[PDB]
C-alpha cells in the first residue's frame, strides 16, 4: 500500500469516525480496558479542567485491576492537568 | 607466568633497538614494537637520539596487529566510508560483557520464556574495529601512544528496538571531522550499527592525538548547525532575505509575509591554516511552518565560498532569527541518586570482551613509556559501568528506556579506584527525561561527566468532553505560557474577524446573553459569514442547502445568543472553549518537552477533537474551532428551545451498584429500553463510563425523571429483575415493570415543561447539559456534519504514523489501524456507503 493511498484511506476513516461519533454511544469502558490492560499504561494524564476521566480511571483500576496490578507489580499514576501539574511538569516541592 | 616484555640490544653499530612486547593479543602470538635510537659517542652529554623517521608508522603497525583483523595498509582516504565485518550477538558474548562491566540488569540475563537483550554499551564491542580504523590513515598522522579518547556517545534511532541475542549487526563508520587544534589533533568518528538493512544506533567517538600538527591540507570539519527560526513580519525582512544569494526558494513568487521559516543547515569546512577556512559550504532545507505547525520544504540554503574567515549564513541566522532548542531545562534539577562504583583490579577481562587490547591498560612498561600514572582503567569501562547505574536508578532497570548516552572522559582512573556518581534529572527532550551525571574519584576530582536520554513510562493522554467547563478555565495558563497565548489568540482572532465575538470574553465573563451587531462594512461581512453557514444535506441525489440562523436575512442588524445561566454552558460555545483550553494545556506540555513520541491518546466525546488536534495535528486551531462551533450549532438546531434558551432534554449518570449489588448493567439496559417504549419518549444509554458504577442516560427530561423514580422505587422495595425474569416467571416481570413505569410517568407528566431534575439514590443529573448528546435524536445531523468535516479535515494533514495504534476512537474502542478488518468493524456499527465501497474495493487500493 502506497503512503498517498494509506493517507486517503486514513482521511476517509477519520472523517467517518468523527462524523458518526456525534450520534453514537461513547464506549469508554472498552477504551479504558485498551489503554489500561492492552498497553499497561503507567501514566494516564487527563487534559481537562475537572478530574472527571481521572476519577473514572481510578475507579476502573480499584474495581477490576487490583489483583492484576499487584501481580505484574506496576505503579499506575492517574494525573489530572488541573490538580497534579507538579507531577506532570516534574517540578516537585523542595 | 613470567614472559619477556622488553628486549634491548644493538641492531647495527650505532642503532639501539628496545623491542617492547605485548603478550596479550588477538591470537596469543606476542607483538613487538621496535623503538630505535641512534647511539652517537661524539656527543657525550646526550649520545642517544630517538629515530623519529617512520616512528608513528611503527606504532600504528603494532596497534593494527592488536586491534584490526585485516592486512596492514594505511593508504585509504579518511573521507571514505569504513565498513566493518558482520557481528552475530551470542549469549556468551553478552554474559561475558555484562559480568566484566558489572551490569546486573535482568534484561541481559537468560530467563525461561523470555529473549535476552544486549546492552547498548555492546554497540562499541560491535563498532570498535570500524570506529578505531578511522584514526589509522597516513593523512591522520599521529603518535598512537599519545592517543586520548575524549568522549563517546550512543543514540538509539527513533522506532528502532534495542539489540537482541541472535541479531546480525553491520557496522559502518565515517570521519565527521578532523581538526588541528593548538594542543593536538581531534578526530570525530560516527559509527552506525545496522540490523536487517535498517539503521539501529549511532556511536559517536572523539579521539585526540596530542602534539603539533600543521598538515591543514588534510583537516576538514562537517558540523550540523542548530535549527534556526525567523518570523517574517515586514517586507523589509523579505527584502534582506531576497538579497542573500544563498537563500533559494523552489518558487521565486512564494508569499513569505507573516510566515515562520526554519533553516536546517549542515556546514562543511576545509582549512588553510589555524583560523582561515580554504572552503566553506552551508547547505540545507528551508522549511515553512504551516497552520497545523507541520514544517514543509519550500527552498534551500546553498552557500559555497573559497578562502573565508567565517560562515556568514550562520552569523545572519544568529542575529536575525532564534535558535530552536530541543532540550528544555526543568525549573529545578531533581536529584535521583549518589552511587558508589569500583574499577576492577585488572583491565584484562574488559580488554578480552571489548577487543580494546591497548597495551597502556594491561602492560606496566607501555603505560610507563606513555607517561601515564599506571595501567589506567579503560575509559569505555567507566562509561559502561556508570551507564549500568543510570539504567538501574533513572530507568528503574528497564534497558529499553535508555535511548541516548554520552560521556566525556575528563581524567584517567587507576584500577581499584572508588568512584561516586551523582545523577540528576535536569531537563526534557521530546518526551525523554534528560539525566546529567558526574563521577568523581577519592580525591573529589571529576573523572567522567555525561548525559542520558531516558524514555518516560508508557503514557496515555485522555481529553475530557462537555460537563467539565467552568468560568475562568485555562486562564491561569493563558497569563503565563507563550504556547497557550498563541493558541487562544489565534482562535480569538478567528472568531472576532468571522463571527464577531471573542471566545476569551465568553470564558472570562460567561455572559447570559451575547448580541452580535451587523453595522458598518465589517458587520456586513460578519453577517454574510452567519448566512454562509449552511447544512449541505444530500436528498434524492440532489444537494439541499438549508440555513442555520434562519432569523438572519439581508435586512438584520443584530443577532442575539440566549442562555439561562451563562453562554459557557451553551454547547456551541462550550465546545470551542473546552477544545481550546485542552489544546492550549497540551501545547504548553509540548513546549516543555513533556510529550512522548509514542504516547497513545483518547478523547471522551468532544475530547476526541482536541486529542486529534493536539497529538496528531489533523486540524489547525482555526479549522478546529470552526468544526466544533458548527458541531455545537448542528446540535442546537435539532433541539427546540424556549425564549430563555432552556430545552426539554438532559443527561443522568446512573450507578447500578448503588441501587442493588444484584442489579447489573444488563438490568439497567432492560429498564431504560422499557421506559423508552411504555412512555413513548426518548431515553437511551449513551456513555458507558465505569463498569457497573457509572452509565449515562441521555434523553427527554421527563423520561429521565421517570427512570430516576423507577430506580428510586426498585432500591426501596429491594426487588431484583434478573432473579425474577428467569427463576419465577417469563414476561410477567415485563407487565409488572410497565405499572411501576406508569406510576412514575403519571407523576412526571403533570410537572411543567422545563422541570428541574432532582438527585435520586442511583441517579444524579448532570449540570449545564441541555442536549441529548450521542443519542439517536442527533442521527439526522450526521449527514450534513460529515459533508462539513470533508471540507475542513484536508487529507494532506492526516499523517497516518501519528494516529496508527495510538488513537482510540469512542465509536470503535480499538486503536486506529488502516486495515480491511478495522473498516469492516466501523461498518458493522455505522452502515455508511463510503466505508462499504472501501471494504469491497480493498484490493484495488492495496495496489
Ligand atoms: C457523574 C459525575 C459528576 C460524578 O463525579 P464526582 O463528582 O467525582 O462523584 P463521586 O463519584 O465522587 O460521588 C459524589 C457523590 O455524588 C453522588 N453520586 C455520584 N454518582 C452517582 C450516581 N451515579 N447516582 C447517584 N448518586 C451519585 C453520591 O451521593 C456520591 O457520594 P459518595 O462520595 O458517598 O459516593 C462525573 O463522573 C461526571 O460528570 N460524569 C459524566 C461525564 C460525561 O459523560 N461527560 C461527557 C458528556 S457526553
UniProtKB/Swiss-Prot annotation, chain A:
Transmembrane segments: none annotated. 4'-phosphopantetheine is transferred from CoA to a specific serine of the Acyl carrier domain by the C-terminal PPT domain. This modification is essential for activity because fatty acids are bound in thioester linkage to the sulfhydryl of the prosthetic group. It comes from the Eukaryota. Coiled coil: none annotated. Signal peptide: none annotated. There is a cross-link at residue 37 (Glycyl lysine isopeptide (Lys-Gly) (interchain with G-Cter in ubiquitin)). The modification Phosphoserine is found at residue 50. [Alpha(6)beta(6)] hexamers of two multifunctional subunits (alpha and beta). Belongs to the thiolase-like superfamily. Fungal fatty acid synthetase subunit alpha family. Fatty acid synthetase catalyzes the formation of long-chain fatty acids from acetyl-CoA, malonyl-CoA and NADPH. The alpha subunit contains domains for: acyl carrier protein, 3-oxoacyl-[acyl-carrier-protein] reductase, and 3-oxoacyl-[acyl-carrier-protein] synthase. This subunit coordinates the binding of the six beta subunits to the enzyme complex. Present with 17000 molecules/cell in log phase SD medium. This is Fatty acid synthase subunit alpha. It comes from Saccharomyces cerevisiae (strain ATCC 204508 / S288c). The gene is FAS2.
From Swiss-Prot, chain B:
There is a cross-link at residue 161 (Glycyl lysine isopeptide (Lys-Gly) (interchain with G-Cter in ubiquitin)). The active site is at 605 (for malonyltransferase activity). Residues 1-423 are annotated as: Dehydratase. Residues 424-642 are annotated as: Malonyl/palmitoyl transferase. GO terms for molecular function: (3R)-hydroxyacyl-[acyl-carrier-protein] dehydratase activity; [acyl-carrier-protein] S-acetyltransferase activity; [acyl-carrier-protein] S-malonyltransferase activity; enoyl-[acyl-carrier-protein] reductase (NADH) activity; enoyl-[acyl-carrier-protein] reductase (NADPH) activity; fatty acid synthase activity; fatty acyl-[ACP] hydrolase activity; fatty-acyl-CoA synthase activity. It comes from the Eukaryota. Residues 320-445 form the MaoC-like domain. One of its GO terms (cellular component) is mitochondrion. Keywords: Acetylation, Fatty acid biosynthesis, Fatty acid metabolism, Hydrolase, Isopeptide bond, Lipid biosynthesis, Lipid metabolism, Lyase, Multifunctional enzyme, NAD, NADP, Oxidoreductase, Phosphoprotein, Transferase, Ubl conjugation. One of its GO terms (biological process) is long-chain fatty acid biosynthetic process. Fatty acid synthetase catalyzes the formation of long-chain fatty acids from acetyl-CoA, malonyl-CoA and NADPH. The beta subunit contains domains for: [acyl-carrier-protein] acetyltransferase and malonyltransferase, S-acyl fatty acid synthase thioesterase, enoyl-[acyl-carrier-protein] reductase, and 3-hydroxypalmitoyl-[acyl-carrier-protein] dehydratase. Present with 91800 molecules/cell in log phase SD medium. [Alpha(6)beta(6)] hexamers of two multifunctional subunits (alpha and beta). Belongs to the fungal fatty acid synthetase subunit beta family. This is Fatty acid synthase subunit beta. It comes from Saccharomyces cerevisiae (strain ATCC 204508 / S288c) (Baker's yeast). The chain holds residues 1204 to 2050 of 2051 of the full protein.
Amino acid at each position: 500500500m502506497k503512503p498517498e493511498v494509506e493517507q486517503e484511506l486514513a482521511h476517509i476513516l477519520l472523517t467517518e469516525l468523527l462524523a458518526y461519533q456525534f450520534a453514537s454511544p461513547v464506549r469508554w469502558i472498552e477504551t479504558q480496558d485498551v489503554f489500561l490492560k492492552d498497553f499497561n499504561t503507567e501514566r494516564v494524564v487527563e487534559i481537562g479542567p475537572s478530574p472527571t476521566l481521572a476519577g473514572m480511571a481510578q475507579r476502573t483500576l480499584k474495581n477490576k485491576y487490583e489483583s492484576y496490578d499487584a501481580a505484574l507489580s506496576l505503579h499506575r499514576e492517574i494525573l489530572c492537568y488541573s490538580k497534579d501539574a507538579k507531577e506532570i511538569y516534574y517540578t516537585p516541592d523542595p | 607466568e613470567l614472559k619477556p616484555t622488553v628486549i634491548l640490544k644493538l641492531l647495527k653499530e650505532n642503532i639501539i633497538q628496545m623491542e617492547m612486547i605485548e603478550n596479550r593479543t588477538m591470537d596469543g602470538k606476542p607483538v613487538s614494537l621496535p623503538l630505535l635510537y641512534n647511539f652517537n659517542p661524539d656527543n657525550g652529554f646526550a649520545p642517544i637520539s630517538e629515530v623519529m623517521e617512520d616512528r608513528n608508522q611503527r606504532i600504528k603497525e603494532m596497534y593494527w596487529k592488536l586491534w584490526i583483523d585485516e592486512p596492514f595498509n594505511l593508504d585509504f582516504d579518511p573521507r571514505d566510508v569504513i565498513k566493518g565485518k558482520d557481528f552475530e550477538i551470542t549469549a556468551k558474548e553478552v554474559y561475558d560483557f555484562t559480568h566484566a562491566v558489572g551490569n546486573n540488569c535482568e534484561d541481559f540475563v537468560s530467563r525461561p520464556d523470555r529473549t535476552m537483550l544486549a546492552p547498548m554499551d555492546f554497540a562499541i564491542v560491535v563498532g570498535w574495529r570500524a570506529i578505531i580504523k578511522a584514526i589509522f590513515p597516513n593523512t591522520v598522522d599521529g603518535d598512537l601512544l599519545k592517543l586520548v579518547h575524549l568522549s563517546n556517545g550512543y543514540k538509539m534511532i527513533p522506532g528502532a528496538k534495542p539489540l537482541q541475542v541472535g541479531d546480525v549487526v553491520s557496522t559502518t563508520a565515517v570521519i565527521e571531522s578532523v581538526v588541528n587544534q593548538p594542543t593536538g589533533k581531534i578526530v570525530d568518528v560516527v559509527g552506525t550499527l545496522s540490523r536487517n538493512g535498517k539503521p539501529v544506533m549511532e556511536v559517536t567517538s572523539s579521539f585526540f592525538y596530542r602534539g603539533n600538527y600543521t598538515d591543514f591540507e588534510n583537516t576538514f570539519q562537517k558540523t550540523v548547525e542548530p535549527v534556526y527560526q525567523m518570523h517574517i513580519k515586514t517586507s523589509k525582512d523579505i527584502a534582506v532575505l531576497r538579497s542573500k544569494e544563498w537563500f533559494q526558494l523552489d518558487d521565486e513568487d512564494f508569499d513569505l509575509l507573516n510566515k515562520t521559516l526554519t533553516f536546517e543547515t549542515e556546514t562543511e569546512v576545509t582549512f588553510k591554516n589555524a583560523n582561515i577556512f580554504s572552503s566553506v559550504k552551508c547547505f540545507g532545507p528551508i522549511k515553512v511552518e504551516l497552520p497545523t505547525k507541520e514544517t514543509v520544504e519550500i527552498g534551500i540554503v546553498d552557500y559555497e565560498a573559497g578562502a573565508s574567515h567565517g560562515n556568514p549564513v550562520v552569523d545572519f541566522l544568529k542575529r536575525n532569527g532564534s535558535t530552536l532548542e530541543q532540550k528544555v531545562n526543568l525549573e529545578n534539577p531533581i536529584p535521583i541518586a549518589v552511587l558508589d562504583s569500583y574499577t576492577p583490579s585488572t583491565n584484562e577481562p574488559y580488554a578480552r570482551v571489548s577487543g580494546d587490547l591497548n597495551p597502556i591498560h594491561v602492560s606496566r612498561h607501555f603505560a610507563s613509556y606513555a607517561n601515564l600514572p599506571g595501567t589506567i582503567t579503560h575509559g569505555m569501562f567507566s562509561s559502561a559501568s556508570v551507564r549500568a547505574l543510570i539504567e538501574n536508578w533513572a530507568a528503574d532497570s528497564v534497558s529499553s528506556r535508555v535511548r541516548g548516552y554520552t560521556c566525556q572522559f575528563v581524567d584517567m582512573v587507576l584500577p581499584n579506584t572508588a568512584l561516586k556518581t551523582s545523577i540528576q534529572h535536569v531537563g526534557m527532550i521530546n518526551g525523554r527525561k534528560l539525566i546529567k551525571f558526574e563521577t568523581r574519584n577519592e580525591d573529589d576530582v571529576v573523572v567522567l561527566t555525561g548525559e542520558a536520554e531516558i524514555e518516560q513510562p508508557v503514557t496515555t493522554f485522555v481529553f475530557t468532553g462537555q460537563g467539565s467547563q467552568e468560568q475562568g478555565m485555562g486562564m491561569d495558563l493563558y497569563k503565563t505560557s507563550k504556547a497557550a497565548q498563541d493558541v487562544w489568540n489565534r482562535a480569538d482572532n478567528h472568531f472576532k474577524d468571522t463571527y464577531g465575538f471573542s471566545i476569551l470574553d465568553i470564558v472570562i465573563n460567561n455572559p447570559v446573553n451575547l448580541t452580535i451587531h451587523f453595522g458598518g462594512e465589517k458587520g456586513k461581512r460578519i453577517r454574510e459569514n452567519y448566512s454562509a453557514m449552511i447544512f449541505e444535506t444530500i436528498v434524492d441525489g440532489k444537494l439541499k442547502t438549508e440555513k442555520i440562523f434562519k432569523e438572519i436575512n439581508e435586512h438584520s442588524t443584530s443577532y442575539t445568543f440566549r442562555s439561562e445561566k451563562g453562554l459557557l454552558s451553551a454547547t456551541q460555545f462550550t465546545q470551542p472553549a473546552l477544545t481550546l483550553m485542552e489544546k492550549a494545556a497540551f501545547e504548553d506540555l509540548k513546549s516543555k518537552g513533556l510529550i512522548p513520541a509514542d504516547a497513545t491518546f483518547a478523547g471522551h466525546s468532544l475530547g476526541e477533537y482536541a486529542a486529534l488536534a493536539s497529538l496528531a495535528d489533523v486540524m489547525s486551531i482555526e479549522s478546529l474551532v470552526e468544526v466544533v462551533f458548527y458541531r455545537g450549532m448542528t446540535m442546537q438546531v435539532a433541539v427546540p428551545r424556549d425564549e430563555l434558551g432552556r430545552s426539554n432534554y438532559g443527561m443522568i449518570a446512573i450507578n447500578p451498584g448503588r441501587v442493588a449489588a444484584s442489579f447489573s448493567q444488563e438490568a439497567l439496559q432492560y429498564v431504560v429500553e422499557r421506559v423508552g417504549k411504555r412512555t413513548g419518549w426518548l431515553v437511551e444509554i449513551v456513555n458507558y463510563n465505569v463498569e457497573n458504577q457509572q452509565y449515562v442516560a441521555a434523553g427527554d427530561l421527563r423520561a429521565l425523571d421517570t427512570v430516576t423514580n423507577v430506580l428510586n422505587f426498585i432500591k426501596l422495595q429491594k426487588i431484583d429483575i434478573i432473579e425474577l425474569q428467569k427463576s419465577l416467571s417469563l414476561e410477567e416481570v415485563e407487565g409488572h415493570l410497565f405499572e411501576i413505569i406508569d406510576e412514575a410517568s403519571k407523576k412526571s407528566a403533570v410537572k411543567p415543561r422545563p422541570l428541574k431534575l432532582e438527585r435520586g439514590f442511583a441517579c444524579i443529573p448532570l449540570v449545564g447539559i441541555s442536549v441529548p448528546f450521542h443519542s439517536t435524536y442527533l442521527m439526522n445531523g450526521v449527514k450534513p456534519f460529515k459533508s462539513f468535516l470533508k471540507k475542513n479535515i484536508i487529507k494532506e494533514n492526516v499523517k497516518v504514523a501519528r494516529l496508527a495504534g495510538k488513537y482510540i476512537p469512542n465509536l470503535t474502542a480499538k486503536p486506529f489501524q488502516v486495515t480491511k478488518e478495522y473498516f469492516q468493524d466501523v461498518y458493522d456499527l455505522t452502515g455508511s456507503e463510503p466505508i462499504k465501497e472501501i471494504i469491497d474495493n480493498w484490493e484495488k487500493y492495496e495496489q
